[PDB]
């Protein structure tokens, strides 16, 4: 499999798992870089939604493939996400869940919620995520059809 | 505290834990009406962002509260859910999330996945849902905030 391009995000109480799992992925050959939009440290109270919506919008832009987003629950940053057009972000703590994010979501962005899920299971699901690859031509296809479906609804003015 | 109008929807992948969470909720004195839509069979292999789509543009329209929604995962309807102006949607399958869904997030959209969450988890934590009410004057509001500023750079035009 090719190596994908990641961006990596966190609000500050993400900051411990989101250094644990770029430093994990890091030696990971099925990750060609890792684009760090912050933050950077606990002391940054930047709000959750402006970090998530730049590192999506990376995704948009084409600069990475992916984006692997903490904050304490993973829930603000993944509602922040799917905001972007043609972005789609799930929270996920366990291996089926993660597994269809890709196969019949193809989800571009995994969210974790440090406060809920433990170091070594978010390590390793992340690894697992890596692996699969969205079929375009499966029967999945046709339903993620209908979220963009419903994009084209919306003109960006601003 | 006051009771909500709910709206529920599942795919074909959940209609078993929707009926048993409709039975479960139907006797619930925080729950003042439950609008169904749908699907209602197994046979019925309407695409899940149809009917999430559906059930979010019900809250945006006044006519109910939150809604909650089942698919296998639980993924594939928060996504959609969130693609509706000012809805915010979650997968949850902890005590904690889910507290934080409603009193961090303001997320009127709460999704589980019948393949990955039991039954009685399911129906303790929709219960639990219903007893946590947001703060619009609390710091989360400000955080809420940045993601509705977001969504004003985009106009309905279809
Ligand atoms: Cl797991
Ligand atoms: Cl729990």
Redesign the interface.
């Known amino acids: 499999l090719p190596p994908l391009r990641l961006a990596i995000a966190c609000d500050d109480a993400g900051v411990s798992y989101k250094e644990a799992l770029k430093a994990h992925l890091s030696d990971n050959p099925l990750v060609s870089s890792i684009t760090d939009v912050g933050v950077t440290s606990t002391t940054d109270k930047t709000?959750?939604?402006?970090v998530a919506?730049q590192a999506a919008q990376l995704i948009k832009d084409g600069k990475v493939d992916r984006a692997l987003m903490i904050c304490?629950?993973?829930?603000?940053v993944?509602?922040?996400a799917?905001?972007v057009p043609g972005i789609?972000?799930?929270?996920?703590?366990?291996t089926?869940?993660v597994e269809?994010?890709i196969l019949?979501?193809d989800?571009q962005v995994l969210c974790f919620?440090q406060?809920?899920i433990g170091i070594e299971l978010a390590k390793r699901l992340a690894g697992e995520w890596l692996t699969y690859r969205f079929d375009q031509k499966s029967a999945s296809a046709?339903?993620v059809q209908?979220?963009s479906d419903?994009?084209?609804?919306?003109?960006?003015?601003?």
Request: aromatic letters at 8%; a positive charge; zero cysteines.
């Open positions: 709000a959750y939604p402006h919506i304490g629950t993973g829930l603000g993944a509602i922040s799917n905001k789609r972000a799930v929270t996920a703590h366990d089926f869940s269809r994010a019949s979501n989800a919620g406060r809920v046709q339903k209908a979220i419903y994009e084209k609804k919306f003109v960006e003015v601003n």
